[PDB]
């Protein structure tokens, strides 16, 4: 099972927690640009992907992709203080969240 | 097999376009409070729900839920100039967008 | 059972209440142009259609189509302060109200 | 039962009340031009028609068709202050009232 | 069982503690350029590799790769005061941490 | 094969090169205190130990423990500018070099 | 074969060259105190020992122990400019050279 977890941080004060378990041929990528961005990502889904990109300051993301197969996550937060929380369990399914600006809130649930 | 689509406007200058076709056992609800809020919503998903509530001024929402089953979409825009675009094709899934404040932008795509 | 309920509002201060239940293969359409127009429309009839058009200011319509089949109801209110009250329960039946001008009152019941 | 109720009002201050019940394959039509004309028309007869035409001001009409079949009732009031009172219950029968000018009163009963 | 642990230190004030136990056909490499960089690396995984490179000043790294097989760790800290903490126990898995700038904190967990 | 290679540096300008290959059940330790100390150490010997201690400034040590078994090398350099060059291939043998002061040169070979 | 070769140097500028080959259960020890002392020692004799002690300045020693068994070699040079050259090959034999003062020269051969 070729499973890859990548964390790239540029700037200062960004924090990332990542978990990949029982997750075969799947990719989890976190890329944070700027400052004070927080990420918490769990992936336990086969042939699945999670891409998290935060660019700016004070953005928060909590992502959970569990039990699914052939499933995709994209989260892109541009700006300041945006909040994202997503759970994805559906198979052959995809979730996309894109927040631009200040103070955005998004919660997504796919079963 | 009951299908309901509802529009409520309170205030002035709010505009709503709604479409429900091939959409069985499904509810689409559109409620705007205030002024200048714009909504364009399409629902063709069985056993599915759309709820958009706009409260404030200049909020814009474009919602599309097609080919899904047992799917729920909720968009709530509080304040001014919030923008939301939501696409929903997954079955047994939920999208929730909650925008608070001014100038918020959110696009959610869930397949 | 393609059931569609459409409300289009252009201008300011228009209010529409629409209800569609137990209503198969049926369309309800409300179109408001101008200002201060009030609409209350309920439809529970199979293979039926409601068409309410209000163009002007201060027009009010109360429209109820219940327990009929293959029934068409149309109200067209042009101008100011027109009042229409229409109840339709007869099957395979049509009601048509046309008001032009100011201060008109029209009552129609079809059983 | 293709039953149609039509109200056309042009001008200002005209009032029309129309009732259609148990009235199959039948037409009720009211046409008011001008101002202050009053109409009260009841229709409960199968395959039968009412045509009321009031053109002018201050004309009053009280019209009832009940329990008839294949019955035609036409009232035409041109001008000002004309009063008409017509009751029709006979089947396969026709009532025609024509008033032109000012202050005419006409009463017709057909059983 | 060819097990190699290499440490290269250039400059001054860099300190590194490295432990390799029960770790067959596996490579652990530490390379520090500059000053005041701290490293603590434990490797007990078969056919696994850990590569740590710190370039700059005041960077801190804590890396634990345990019980895995065919597992890769890459940690690269460029700049000042970066902190990294990574634990990997998953087999056939890869963790990559890259920090650029000042004051980054990165945590990686892979089981 | 529990094989551990540790280098501790306290102070500034110290440089340490260490390689451990084909070396089962063996420890290589380098400890540098002060400034500008240079060490290069290779270990390929089974059940062997390397202890290099440099305390001061400008000390240089070149240590090669190859093809031996049950072999110990200890080199201790206190002060400034000491040079030691030691090669050890003999099995069940021990080499001990102690330099105190300034400008010492010592060469040790054991086959 | 427990074979030990130890060189202890205290002071400055001391130089020692030491060779132990084919020499089982044997000890070779050099102790130099002071400055400029030179030692060159080869040991290839079984169950035998070499002890060289130089205390002072400018002392020189060339010691060769070969093909003997159960042999002991001791040279003690105290002071300045002392010279010692010793070859031992005899079995069950001991050579002892003691030089005190300045400018002493001693040659020992035992076959």
Residue numbers in the entry:
A (entry chain D), B (entry chain E), C (entry chain F), D (entry chain G), E (entry chain C), F (entry chain B), ...: 41 to 151
Lines quoted from the article behind this entry:
Curli fibrils, widely expressed by Enteric bacteria like Escherichia coli and Salmonella spp., integrate into the extracellular matrix, promoting structural scaffolding, adhesion, and host colonization. The curli system consists of seven proteins encoded by two discrete operons (csgBAC and csgDEFG), which regulate the assembly of a major structural subunit, CsgA, and a minor subunit, CsgB, into curli fibrils. Using cryo-EM, we have shed the first light on the cryo-EM structure of E. coli CsgA fibrils, revealing that the amylogenic regions of CsgA adopt non-centrosymmetric beta-helical structures.
Acceptable initial 3D models were generated by using box sizes of 218 and 260 pixels. The overall architecture of CsgA fibrils illustrated that seven and eight CsgA subunits could be assigned to the map of 218-pixel and 260-pixel box size, respectively.
